[PDB]
Write a protein that binds this ligand. Structure first.
Ligand SMILES: Cc1cc2nc3c(=O)[nH]c(=O)nc-3n(C[C@H](O)[C@H](O)[C@H](O)COP(=O)(O)OP(=O)(O)OC[C@H]3O[C@@H](n4cnc5c(N)ncnc54)[C@H](O)[C@@H]3O)c2cc1C
Ligand code: NFU
Ligand code: NFU
Ligand code: SF4
Ligand code: SF4
Ligand code: SF4
Ligand code: SF4
Ligand code: FES
Ligand SMILES: [Fe+3]
Ligand SMILES: [Fe+3]
Lengths: 253, 291, 437, 437
């Protein structure tokens, strides 16, 4: 089989998503060596225009008043088999939800939307910053989905399904996810995972129940993602020891 | 009742200016917006009104509930950046204890009031206490940073020296207190406009009781539309009381011909924008508040 | 004069372009390097928000240097409200700061080496390639960045967007075991950064001895004074920074003024020179209109009425009177900063009391007074200014290193063959998301 | 070695000459630039006079920079007596100061351009001539100086010998209308000085690319290191100055000592080389005796026992580590100071309270204590020192920029062809009436 073709597309992002990918260290070099060709990434390489990609890792949101940005995100959908919203800005808007214009030297750059409001998104990788391990798992599994035996492609499709469901669920992320869709649904069981995942310490547990500092929350969508009562896909997660060994072998020298 | 497709619904249109020489000293145009609110207060049609007062930075407006002739006059002259007039609409009926609220503002602010009157959403007591609205013509507005950039850079003027600003004859004009004049081609200002103005389908404040503006009238005069029964009662009385000089608009150049054409260009350009929102993405579009 | 334009730039952070007037030989007469990154507008959206939230939003300006905005923003709040943080909080912030400088300088090694030559040869580094010596260099860089991110995560709570800093100090002190782990890693890192530093200095010295470089198959001459400018430099500390709480602050806000690009950038031009062979995808089509004054996305901060250079060379020039200028001098000064980072971490760990307090006992809420804080980010002086009143941000302003370097680097472009204008740019280690915020 | 002498110098302020030993090629081996302006003796006549009178006499040392002596003298009195002036007095003094720097730098453009070339040509600027481009340049310079003098007159009371400064602050605050007028003029001036600055920098860059210049019909080679010296620089502020009232003064009087010309100048020589064709009137007749030690009219202030350079390059080198030296570097640094003047005026006007107090409520009469004040005059650090007792000046001393630059520029003459020794001199923007006082 061939290596799949992967691009990193940079919209209104901070490059922390790219840094997260790079923080797989020799893992990334192993993937680039054996499974994937980086065909486009302005930060790392000199390909100036968006080429065709099997997988586009798209970070950042879209500024509606920046013509080239709107064209880039449409061109990306047109050029890509699989579009991945990489990180919470691409998935959910994140800190650019708060953008409201008025700053030099483009006071009209006022409106930012997650990429899923402008194009169809196949896969979400939520997180701010996203976990290096997640970006790696998704790249490996995308390779298996495209180049593996049908036993692998079956595993890969089952692994990615909840990240594809997230992309179909919507383009909003907030502390309030845990109210709306977990506590208010009768699904919260007080494990406290949301509090560990929150990057800004906006979540405490009081008598076993989430308490959200909404004016600290930066709307990244991490806590609903990590909650074991958002998606819990038993067919994958109960096979954790096996899937771990499979991923590890794919990275071994 | 004329029902014009670009100038909205109205009973008459005249060219007018206030007979109050104190008001005219600092009015942008004819002094219609100030004269109508002062008169409404002294006659008791209103007991207070929302006007764009002076704010904390030069040429930045601050909405305020004015309840005296003196406080109304402080709001004279056009501030070409955003003044959130409607933020005091409910409060005017609470701690201010008003029974008859006046509102001044531009076309979208007139729309906000009428929406509040028909669909009050946590706007208790507002439908029945709105007593009088005067709407300004408005082609587009700017953030304060936009206005600073235009005046300080493009016109090379200090904001603290500016006496009047005026968009007319294709140029953004700056008049200083010491007597100088600077202009900027409107083409240079386009990047700075507030983006939400680009879906606006209303030029001459279609939904106000009385609408007033500059285009169609010579300098020092205003083009005025009298639209609603409220608007007609107050205007008739005010004219009868000596408050205004008038001229039928069709005896005035350039008059309603130019005005109806500028209204048409605004609506057509912004209706196109509204249309392009629908297919803005790939197999996806942006929201249309008018849908 | 003709006008050529490279858009986008590459092997730098974020989105910019070069709009260049060139003479009959293709040498830049006057070039503008400008941001075309959309303005997310952090300074305006900050108004009314809590002083606890604004630093964590400001962190998301940039994922390479989030330490710089987290600390400068927090310490601007602390300076405005008059909050003095505990010693052990300060030590942990310094460890976080030094660690991040290591990871950033090492990342920039990856971005610039493809322009550089294996010494004594005509082969350029291709770091993707699984061949020597590139692969052993990549292995070293990769371990350096891993160590640095790990230390950052332990002292700062997260390597990207650190969670441990808060108004008044830190959420957490570290365990005795974590303190030992940071020391063990810094010992390892110190040997590695000494090796990487010597390697990079050798590569740069070889560049300084070359007469030409190859771009798109053509020989491009290397000017002796590549990247020289006359703007001088600005720096507030060799390592950490300074704030208005200090007895003798090392930055002078009465010398600063910020203009729009207007005062310093070219107006409308039309591209009439195009090279479709420029690697990889060519330059802007002939006939395109450009207008740097209007397209530039940044403000232009000045010091004594002029743009200045910030960053590692600015720090070495200010604090040791380092006396080389231009592109290769900038590269040299950056590599020379590697060892201070590891010695500083080890000295800070030696003084850190893992039982010590990390949060001030009293956090005032502010009366509207102005305070400011400078952090010496990897790319240079990062100055945040704030007025906090009743725990809310009433006024906020950010003067970020690449913002300062944008007009200065533009001026340094004069004299360069337009095909290596991008090499002049990369010596500034640009972060265009930072510059724009 | 032969000895040639140019007397008088031209296109500078006041009366000096160049007494030059040259090698067989006509290159200066050792040259002395010296004042031959009569000593009006301001420091000695000051003794016993009132502290109110002495600054107004000191103003009349020089009509180009009277602001510098008015302010340095007044603030030396204020420093000796311990008088703290009101904020709005200080703001008005800064506006006065910045305005005058504009007029002086622009006047110096008129003096130096006849040595410079219309870029890419062999024609030199003749600013008298009613032809382009000289006439449009003159029109811009003339409006710049007019604006500057006008602002100076409004804030300072008079453009030449300002009347508004007094012990304790100012005689007058300005009206709301005057404040608007100064802002309007500064807005206009800022655009103009940006244009003039870019014009001058282009002209200087062209000079740096020339191999020769024409003097008296002959080609004179242009050395690469024209005007280089090893004295280093001294500066007290990038804009205004410093005084002994400050918490941390930026000038150190224990490092200063003033000698007679004796220690630094040549003794008796005889001119044996004469060029009657030197434009326009030739050089000193063969056989003339000269003695710089005895004919020099100035004292020689030193810093750490050596002459130093002061002025715009000294300020940019001290405060931004500007790193170019010599004649064209001096010219560059001076033009770069244009915009700070206009931004400073506008910022000061923005902070000026036109109802605010301008005179200290109490003016002490002094007990004989020494105080000092430095003003960064357009030509460099102007330091006045005083002991005031019972309202009278008991001791007075003046270290004026061109006084400092006289021995330093002399040393910079080495290596120049004697026919462009005067170009080395003019980069110092000499004020010989200032240097002598
Ligand atoms: C953004 C803006 C765009 C405009 N564009 C046009 C145009 O294209 N064509 C045209 O003919 N007229 C336009 N106008 C109206 C015109 O500039 C005058 O405001 C109008 O003629 C009323 O003048 P006057 O003499 O009657 O009022 P004055 O007696 O001078 O009183 C001024 C009135 O204007 C209100 N006002 C001033 N600034 C604002 C503001 N920012 N926001 C809300 N209300 C404000 C005040 O509350 C007060 O009621 C515009 C006005 C604004 C604010
Ligand atoms: N280093 C750095 Fe940032 Ni991504 C920049 N420029 C800033 O503070
Ligand atoms: N500038 C200036 Fe003067 Ni006429 C000199 N030298 C001084 O203070
Ligand atoms: S998701 Fe977070 S780390 Fe990724 S681009 Fe957005 S701010 Fe940066
Ligand atoms: S992670 Fe989910 S189930 Fe666990 S405490 Fe938080 S909301 Fe409740
Ligand atoms: S509460 Fe924390 S994890 Fe959840 S959306 Fe907000 S910032 Fe993200
Ligand atoms: S153009 Fe429309 S939306 Fe914009 S300020 Fe004027 S009336 Fe309001
Ligand atoms: S939607 Fe959560 S404040
Ligand atoms: Fe900023
Ligand atoms: Fe003296």
């Amino acid at each position: 089989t061939n290596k799949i073709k992967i691009g990193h597309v940079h919209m209104s992002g901070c490059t922390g998503c790219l840094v997260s990918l790079a923080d797989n260290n020799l893992g990334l070099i192993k993937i680039l060596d054996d499974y994937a060709d980086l065909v486009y990434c302005l930060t790392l390489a000199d390909v100036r225009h968006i080429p065709e990609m099997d997988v586009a890792l798209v970070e950042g949101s879209v500024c509606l008043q920046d013509h080239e940005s709107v064209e880039d995100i449409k061109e990306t959908r047109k050029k890509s088999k699989i579009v991945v919203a990489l990180g919470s800005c691409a998935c959910y808007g994140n800190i650019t939800r708060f953008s409201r214009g008025g700053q030099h030297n483009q006071p009209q750059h006022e409106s930012y939307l997650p990429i899923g409001d402008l194009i169809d998104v196949d896969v979400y990788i939520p997180g701010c910053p996203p976990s290096p391990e997640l970006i790696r798992n998704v790249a490996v599994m995308a390779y298996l989905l495209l180049e593996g035996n049908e036993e692998q492609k079956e595993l890969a499709g089952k692994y990615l399904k909840p990240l594809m469901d997230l992309a179909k669920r919507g383009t909003s992320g907030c502390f309030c996810d845990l109210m709306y869709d977990v506590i208010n649904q009768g699904l919260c069981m007080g494990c406290g995972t949301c509090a560990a995942s929150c990057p800004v310490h906006a979540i405490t547990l009081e008598f076993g129940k989430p308490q959200g500092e909404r004016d600290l929350c930066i709307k990244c969508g991490s806590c609903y993602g990590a909650c074991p009562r958002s998606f819990f896909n038993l067919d994958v997660i109960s096979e954790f020891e096996n899937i771990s060994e499979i991923i590890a072998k794919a990275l071994k020298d | 009742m004329i029902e014009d497709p670009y100038l909205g619904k109205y009973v008459t249109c005249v060219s007018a200016r206030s007979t109050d020489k104190e008001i005219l000293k600092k009015a942008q145009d004819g002094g219609i917006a100030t004269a109508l609110m002062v008169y409404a207060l002294e006659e008791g049609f209103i007991d207070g009104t929302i006007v764009a007062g002076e704010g904390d930075k030069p040429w930045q407006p601050k909405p305020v509930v004015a309840m005296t002739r003196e406080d109304i006059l402080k709001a004279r002259g056009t501030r070409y950046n955003i003044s959130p007039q409607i933020s005091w609409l409910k409060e005017a009926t609470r701690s201010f204890g008003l029974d008859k609220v006046g509102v001044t503002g531009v076309c979208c602010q007139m729309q906000a009031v009428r929406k509040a009157q028909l669909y009050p959403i946590n706007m208790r007591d507002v439908p029945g206490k709105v007593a009088f609205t005067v709407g300004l013509f408005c082609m587009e507005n700017f953030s304060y940073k936009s206005l600073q950039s235009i005046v300080e850079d493009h016109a090379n003027q200090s904001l603290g020296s500016v006496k009047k600003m005026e968009i007319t004859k294709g140029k953004f004009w700056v008049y200083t207190e010491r007597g100088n004049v600077a202009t900027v081609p409107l083409k240079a200002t386009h990047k700075y406009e507030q983006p939400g103005c680009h879906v606006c389908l209303d030029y001459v404040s279609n939904l106000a009781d009385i609408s007033t503006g500059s285009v169609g009238s010579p300098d020092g005069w205003s083009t005025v539309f009298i639209r609603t029964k409220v608007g007609n009662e107050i205007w008739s009385k005010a004219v009868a009381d000596g408050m205004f000089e008038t001229k039928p608009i069709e005896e005035v150049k350039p008059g309603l011909d130019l005005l109806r054409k500028l209204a048409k260009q605004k609506i057509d350009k912004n209706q196109k924008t509204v249309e392009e929102r629908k297919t803005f993405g790939i197999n996806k579009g942006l929201r249309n508040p008018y849908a | 004069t003709k006008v050529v334009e490279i858009s986008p730039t590459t092997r730098l952070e974020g989105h910019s372009k070069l709009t260049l007037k060139v003479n009959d030989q293709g040498i830049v007469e006057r070039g503008d390097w400008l941001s075309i990154t959309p303005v997310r507008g952090i300074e305006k959206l900050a108004i009314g928000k809590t002083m606890e939230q604004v630093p964590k939003i400001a962190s998301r300006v940039c994922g390479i240097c989030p330490i710089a905005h987290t600390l400068a923003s927090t310490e601007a709040m602390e300076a405005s409200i008059g909050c003095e943080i505990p010693t052990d909080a300060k030590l942990l912030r310094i460890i976080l700061h030094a660690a991040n400088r290591i990871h950033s300088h090492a990342l920039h090694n990856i971005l610039i080496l493809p322009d550089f030559y294996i010494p004594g040869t005509e082969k350029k580094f291709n770091l993707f390639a699984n061949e020597q010596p590139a692969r052993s260099v990549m292995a070293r860089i990769v371990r350096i960045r891993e160590i640095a991110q790990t230390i950052a995560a332990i002292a700062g709570g997260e390597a990207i967007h650190p969670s441990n800093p808060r108004i008044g100090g830190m959420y957490h002190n570290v365990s005795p075991r974590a303190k030992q782990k940071m020391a063990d890693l810094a010992k390892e890192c110190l040997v590695l950064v000494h090796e990487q530093m010597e390697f990079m200095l050798d590569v740069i010295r070889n560049m300084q001895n070359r007469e030409f470089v190859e771009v798109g198959g053509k020989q491009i001459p290397l000017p002796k004074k590549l990247g020289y400018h006359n703007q001088g430099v600005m720096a507030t500390a060799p390592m950490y920074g300074s704030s208005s709480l200090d007895d003798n602050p090392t930055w002078d806000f009465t010398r600063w003024k910020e203009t729009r690009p207007w005062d310093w950038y070219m107006g409308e031009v039309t591209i009439d020179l195009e090279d479709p062979s420029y690697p990889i995808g060519g330059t802007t089509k002939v006939g395109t209109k450009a207008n740097p004054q209007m397209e530039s996305c940044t403000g232009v901060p000045t010091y004594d009425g002029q743009p200045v250079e910030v960053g590692p060379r600015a720090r070495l020039a200010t604090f040791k009177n380092f006396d080389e200028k231009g592109t290769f001098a900038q590269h040299i000064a950056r590599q020379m900063e590697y060892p201070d980072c590891c010695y500083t971490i080890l000295n800070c760990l030696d003084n850190l009391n893992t039982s010590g307090k990390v949060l001030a006992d009293h956090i005032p809420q502010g009366d509207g007074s102005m305070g400011w804080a400078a952090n010496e980010a990897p790319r240079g002086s990062n100055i945040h200014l704030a007025r906090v009143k009743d725990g809310k941000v009433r006024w906020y302003d950010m003067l970020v290193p690449t913002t300062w370097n944008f007009p200065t680097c533009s001026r340094a472009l004069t004299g360069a063959p337009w095909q290596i204008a991008e090499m002049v740019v990369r010596a500034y280690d640009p972060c265009v998301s930072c510059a724009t915020h």
